[PDB]
Amino acid sequence: ESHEQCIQWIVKFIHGQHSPKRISFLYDCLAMAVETGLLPPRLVCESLINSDTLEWERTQLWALTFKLVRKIIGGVDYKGVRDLLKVILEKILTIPNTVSSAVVQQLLAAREVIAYILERNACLLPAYFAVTEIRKLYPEGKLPHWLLGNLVSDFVDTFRPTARINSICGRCSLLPVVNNSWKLDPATLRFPLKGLLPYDKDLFEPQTALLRYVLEQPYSRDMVCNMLGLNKQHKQRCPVLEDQLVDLVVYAMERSETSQLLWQHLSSQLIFFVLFQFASFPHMVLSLHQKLAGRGLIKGRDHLMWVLLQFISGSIQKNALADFLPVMKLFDLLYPEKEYIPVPDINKPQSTHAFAMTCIWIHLNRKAQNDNSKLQIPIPHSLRLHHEFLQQSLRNKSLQMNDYKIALLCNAYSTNSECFTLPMGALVETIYGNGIMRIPLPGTNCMASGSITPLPMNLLDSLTVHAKMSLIHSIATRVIKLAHAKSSVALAPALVETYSRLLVYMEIESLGIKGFISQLLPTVFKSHAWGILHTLLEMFSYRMHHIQPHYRVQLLSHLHTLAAVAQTNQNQLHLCVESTALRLITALGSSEVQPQFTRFLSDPKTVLSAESEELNRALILTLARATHVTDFFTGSDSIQGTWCKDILQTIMSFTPHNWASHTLSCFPGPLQAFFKQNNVPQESRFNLKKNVEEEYRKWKSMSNENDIITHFSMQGSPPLFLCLLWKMLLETDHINQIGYRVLERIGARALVAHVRTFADFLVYEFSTSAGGQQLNKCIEILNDMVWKYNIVTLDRLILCLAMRSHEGNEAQVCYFIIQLLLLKPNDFRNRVSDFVKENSPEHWLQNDWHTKHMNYHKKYPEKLYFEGLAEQVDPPVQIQSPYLPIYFGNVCLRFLPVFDIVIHRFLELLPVSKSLETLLDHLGGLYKFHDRPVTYLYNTLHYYEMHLRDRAFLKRKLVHAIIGSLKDNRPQGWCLSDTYLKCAWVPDDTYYCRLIGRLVDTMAGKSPGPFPNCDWRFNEFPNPAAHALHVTCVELMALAVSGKEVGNALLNVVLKSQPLVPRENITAWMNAIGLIITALPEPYWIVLHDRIVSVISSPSLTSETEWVGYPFRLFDFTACHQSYSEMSCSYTLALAHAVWHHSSIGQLSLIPKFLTEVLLPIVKTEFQLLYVYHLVGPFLQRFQQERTRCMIEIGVAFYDMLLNVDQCSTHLNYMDPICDFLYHMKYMFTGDSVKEQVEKIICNLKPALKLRLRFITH
């Protein structure tokens, strides 16, 4: 209380005293009082500086006050000195630029006190606090105050080495592959930097190149939203995003001047941002008009008008007319001259593009007619032909489908109701088949509409977004009406194909794919149709390419509840649900399992199944593969604490099972530990044999009609009726009518358990049976039971065989059964040979698919209701169950996921490697119809690198069989390089240079292109970059060269003086190398540690040289003419930063162990210590967000290294940068966590270092 008042009174009396001598005397008395301890120095300093009467005008009074504070400022804690520095700088800032020359000499007192505070020898406060306040109150780009002078600039200049330590080399030139490192500030397009340090000038500018690259790539909508922080909560109205899209449009027109895919991508992309209120259409148009004005070069005018028409047609009703007026100004600038524009040729798709402006005028005029008067939009004088041609075409009653006139009418008259029913009717009646006769469908007693010709893809691309929404709404309404009507007539194949082709457009996501799962499927489910549901599920399985993971998981849950309830005890529906679920589980990505399963820990049973053990095992296999590829468990040896525990426990509580040793040995460690416990006892082979024999004897002794049916179909009895069947066919080779009746009453959902037990019974019987004639007889019986009698399907039988838990010889005979069943009979081989010969996988370019489908099904009919057994029973029984519509699938397409699983099991078991070669040779052509062959090859080689390490012939055979089976359907050079086709041998440096260069040119973007262009809407990869990365990885994996050699060669591409890799572009090569080596398995990217150790032991860092200044040249690769040693030292650091930038958190978890056990015992000099700080510095932020524990190890390792270097070295020349880095780390990342172990290390340091870091403990 009275301390502040008394000091203020004394100082104010001093202010009012006109005697400077008395002023000095009273200051001296106050100084003596502070010296003797009468008053707290912090309170005295605060009161003196915060005194209001103290003004710059009284120059002698100001100087004496600042002299007093300078004398007595040294007795304050560091936090106080920081606060007094804050208030002093605030007070100094009030000084104007120009002052009198007679008071300058007396105003230096502020400079004297600020210099004393900033002095490092005094160590009053940590220098990080001082630079933080200076940087906070002086932002980047502000000149220092003239009174302060160059002292502040030099002090800030002291911290650049720390800024370079905490910076990633070549960050602005690193680009990702679109599928927290790439986050940007929404307001300024700037990287989020930690702390207030003088970073490089390149980090203070927007990342326009990065944002443009992400925007240009297809399917980058979600990534852009994540990068810019758009939460989809309200109208963000992001100005930088709007400007980038406008510049992208300008650049597209620039390319158009002296491109169709880019224009389609723009029209497809910038619709979403405008529709979600992220950008404004009128503001976009005005900005585009202003930018394009005065430049000319007008050749992409038709494409730009096509882009604008999408909004003009799709949002005219829900927006005011005032927002679309500037389009007229855009026309005035973009279309010169007054001559009548000629009518283009209507036979080309570009005719729709050339009529875009006319359609815009029609929409605008119609919107003007609504709410008439006020304003009227007249016709331009140069659109008379375009208007008359449209009206004359409208007046025509008959319209043909050989031209694009109907597309022109739909695009122009999509708003007026009266002039739109006729073109819509003419467009939908060609696929609805309302008047034509009826066609047969595969199966028995199934008919559909006569339409077989769907709408062509190029015609669909010629329509507009609004027309496509109207078409898809009409199709959906007709489907719902048919579902409610309960009619036995199936939908037209043309309607189904057109719907599937329309569901690949992302602009209709509001009701295209969202309404397909949210509304249409539940409506058909409640309507109890079972015919449309089968059609939609088959459409999902065989005609869908790109679907978001959450939609896929949602349909997985819908499939599981559909199979669980609603009494879906039909063979066709049950098989369709099982096949769709198996494909959906298998096709899951590696980086999508955790984010899509983390939201279902509330009710895991929604996604997990209740009775399908095969589906549960498939989910477990996918989970193990994803966790292995993503390196999730690297660092943690316990499964508890992760999301997998709840899912695995729920699986074990639903379908308990065991795992084979060879299959379990490839699982990650936590999964192996989980399955070591939770082991379920299994049935004995003697017990199973005795039970089957006793039941079979009971079957002989029983003669009553009802007793057999009521006994062998009981629920809860052991599922061993298939074993009864098998035993009757090897004892008597005939089945009675009672057996057919039992099979009919068991049910599809109950026969699965019988198949499961039959597989184990089947394996045990071959194992204990004489080979030769008995083996040939017993495989002939199985062939008859599969094809001749139609008891079980081949795909389900092989899947159940491959999902068993046998060991050793039992596993060998189990896989030998699959071998014999697949190859020894001629049935499957003939079916696959025919299908591959006369079919093609490109379904989006075909028009006779139904005819080819009918031809195959007529040649090879499919039975799903025990038709063969029904006919072969001695009294011929007749079955008249209607067949659900079948449009796309067959046995060959259904077997594909089972064949992938079979390959994996054959790879797991060692003594059966020769069988896989024979399997691939005979049935390798079936991969022509695979959906993700390259991704499957990448996953298979990545997962089984250890097992395929010593077997290169099998690896090459697998790669060639999968890849070369599609060589007649894609352009040359799509996957493998020319050198590989001529050599496959030790690859040389040129091979790796060209391999990396292919990805570099693909990412850069070139007109010829290393890889051929493809329609990514119907491809497994969204962008060329992902395709290039995966094919490069697959080729490198298939190389018969050790992983260490491959990694060394890839590093040597940059780190050795080599042609074909020019300077001024080395960062792009480093980025490509980092991406490739990160995607490669562990033995490939482990050579980085060895290379770092080699540079650490280099004489460049080991030498006790007398360099003046900070050694900047060793850590920056963009330097002047460099010697070999310095060039290698800087290039290794840059390459390490590039690799670690693209690495996952599991891959980064090995750095603390590497520092602790490798670098620590060999770091003994200041240069090695600085090199380690440069290497591991910039990546502490990543550990802060995911793995907190690794921070503690890194911090103690750094202090241990500092202790070792201090003890070994006589003196240190760069104490200040080390001090600043440790202070920065403590105040930003680690904090107070490390205290006890820090004190022990600090106490043993030299007195100079102890004085420098006396504030770490506090």
Q: Which residues contact 626 (CB under 8 A, 6 or more apart)?
A: 588, 589, 590, 591, 593, 594, 632
Token pair for 264: 């389609």
Q: What are phi and psi of 562, to 5 degrees?
A: -65, -40
Q: Collapsing DSSP states into helix, strand and coil, what is residue 438?
A: strand
Helix 669-676 × helix 644-654 angle, to 10°:
30
Neighbours of 1108 (CB within 10 A): 6
Token pair for 1230: 């680690």
Distance CA 1166, CA 1215 (A): 9
Angle at 1083 between CA 1080 and CA 1089, to 5 degrees: 105
Neighbours of 848 (CB within 10 A): 11
Shared domain check, 183 and 149? no
Shared domain check, 1137 and 1068? no
Distance CA 696, CA 689 (A): 11
Shared domain check, 348 and 202? no
Contact (Cβ atoms closer than 8 angstroms) between residue 411 and residue 352: yes
Contact (Cβ atoms closer than 8 angstroms) between residue 245 and residue 284: yes
Distance CA 582, CA 442 (A): 23
Tell me whether residue 51 is in a domain: yes
- The string of DSSP letters for 702-770 reads ---HHHHHHHHT-TTS-S-HHHHHHHHHHHTS---HHHHHHHHHH-HHHHHHHHHHHHHHHHHHHHTS-
Shared domain check, 1189 and 1091? yes
Largest Cα span, the chain? 134
Q: What are phi and psi of 448, to 5 degrees?
A: -140, 180
Handedness of CA 1022, 1025, 1028, 1031 (dihedral sign): negative
Long-range contacts of 445-449 (CB under 8 A, 24+ apart): 445/880, 445/882, 445/883, 446/490, 446/882, 446/883, 446/884, 446/885, 446/886, 447/488, 447/489, 447/490, 448/489, 448/490, 448/491, 448/492, 448/493, 448/885, 449/489, 449/490, 449/491, 449/492, 449/494, 449/495
Shared domain check, 132 and 8? yes
Distance CA 539, CA 546 (A): 13
Q: Collapsing DSSP states into helix, strand and coil, what is residue 439?
A: strand
Token pair for 195: 């702390």
Domain boundary pick from 781, 804, 825: 825
Residue 37's H or E segment, with its range, is none
Contact (Cβ atoms closer than 8 angstroms) between residue 1222 and residue 1256: yes
Distance CA 259, CA 253 (A): 9
Shared domain check, 1104 and 1022? no
Token pair for 1061: 């890799």
Distance of CA 817 to the CA centre of its chain: 40
Tell me whether residue 550 is in a domain: no
Shared domain check, 326 and 313? yes
Residue 282 buriedness (CB in 10 A; 0-12 / 13-18 / 19+): middle
Handedness of CA 550, 554, 555, 557 (dihedral sign): positive
Tell me whether residue 904 is in a domain: no
Report the domain count for the chain.
6
Residue 491 buriedness (CB in 10 A; 0-12 / 13-18 / 19+): buried
Distance CA 1095, CA 1079 (A): 25
Give the residue from 655, 659, 457 showing the smallest Cα distance to 543: 457
Domain that holds residue 188: 170-229
Distance of CA 234 to the CA centre of its chain: 25
Contact (Cβ atoms closer than 8 angstroms) between residue 454 and residue 539: no
Tell me whether residue 1047 is in a domain: yes
Contact (Cβ atoms closer than 8 angstroms) between residue 162 and residue 199: no
Distance CA 1101, CA 1026 (A): 39
Distances in Å between the Cα of 745 and the Cα atoms of 78, 618, 726, 740, 872 are 86, 29, 18, 9, 18
**Residue type at 174?**
L
Tell me whether residue 22 is in a domain: yes
Q: Collapsing DSSP states into helix, strand and coil, what is residue 449?
A: strand
Q: What are phi and psi of 989, to 5 degrees?
A: -65, -35
**Residue type at 554?**
Q
Q: Which residue has the tokens 């400007």?
A: 243
Q: Which residues contact 794 (CB under 8 A, 6 or more apart)?
A: 786, 787, 821, 828, 891, 895
Angle at 598 between CA 594 and CA 600, to 5 degrees: 130
Token pair for 773: 């004639």
- Burial string for 992-1007 (b: 16+ CB within 10 Å, else e) reads bbebbbbbbbbbeeee
Tell me whether residue 1057 is in a domain: yes
Give the residue from 1098, 964, 989 showing the smallest Cα distance to 1054: 989
Domain boundary pick from 1085, 1113, 1128: 1085
Tell me whether residue 843 is in a domain: no
Q: Collapsing DSSP states into helix, strand and coil, what is residue 479?
A: helix
Shared domain check, 248 and 145? no
- Burial string for 755-775 (b: 16+ CB within 10 Å, else e) reads bbbbbbbbbbbbeeeeeeeee
Shared domain check, 260 and 145? no
What does this entry list as its resolution, in Å? 3.1
Angle at 1091 between CA 1086 and CA 1095, to 5 degrees: 155
Token pair for 186: 């929404």
Distance CA 709, CA 1114 (A): 86
Q: Collapsing DSSP states into helix, strand and coil, what is residue 447?
A: strand
Helix 1066-1079 × helix 1043-1055 angle, to 10°:
170
Domain boundary pick from 762, 794, 825: 825
Contact (Cβ atoms closer than 8 angstroms) between residue 256 and residue 307: no
Give the residue from 55, 97, 269 showing the smallest Cα distance to 1023: 269
Method: cryo-EM
**Residues composing the chain:** 1258
Long-range contacts of 1251-1255 (CB under 8 A, 24+ apart): 1251/123, 1252/123, 1252/1215, 1252/1219, 1253/1219, 1253/1222, 1253/1223, 1254/123, 1255/78, 1255/125, 1255/126, 1255/1223
Shared domain check, 1198 and 1152? yes
Q: Which residues contact 777 (CB under 8 A, 6 or more apart)?
A: 730
Helix 405-412 × helix 356-369 angle, to 10°:
30
Distance of CA 238 to the CA centre of its chain: 24
- The string of DSSP letters for 599-615 reads GGSS-GGGTS-SS-HHH
Q: Collapsing DSSP states into helix, strand and coil, what is residue 490?
A: strand
Residue 440's H or E segment, with its range, is strand 438-440
Tell me whether residue 920 is in a domain: no
- The string of DSSP letters for 601-657 reads SS-GGGTS-SS-HHHHHHHHHHHHHHHHHTT-STT----TTSTHHHHHHHHHHHS--
Q: Which residue has the tokens 């710059």?
A: 56
Shared domain check, 390 and 272? yes
Distance CA 919, CA 912 (A): 11
Angle at 490 between CA 486 and CA 493, to 5 degrees: 150
Distances in Å between the Cα of 634 and the Cα atoms of 144, 589, 670 are 50, 19, 10
The DSSP symbol for 172 reads G
Shared domain check, 371 and 267? yes
Angle at 913 between CA 908 and CA 917, to 5 degrees: 120
Q: What are phi and psi of 182, to 5 degrees?
A: -115, 20
Contact (Cβ atoms closer than 8 angstroms) between residue 712 and residue 721: yes
Q: Collapsing DSSP states into helix, strand and coil, what is residue 346?
A: coil
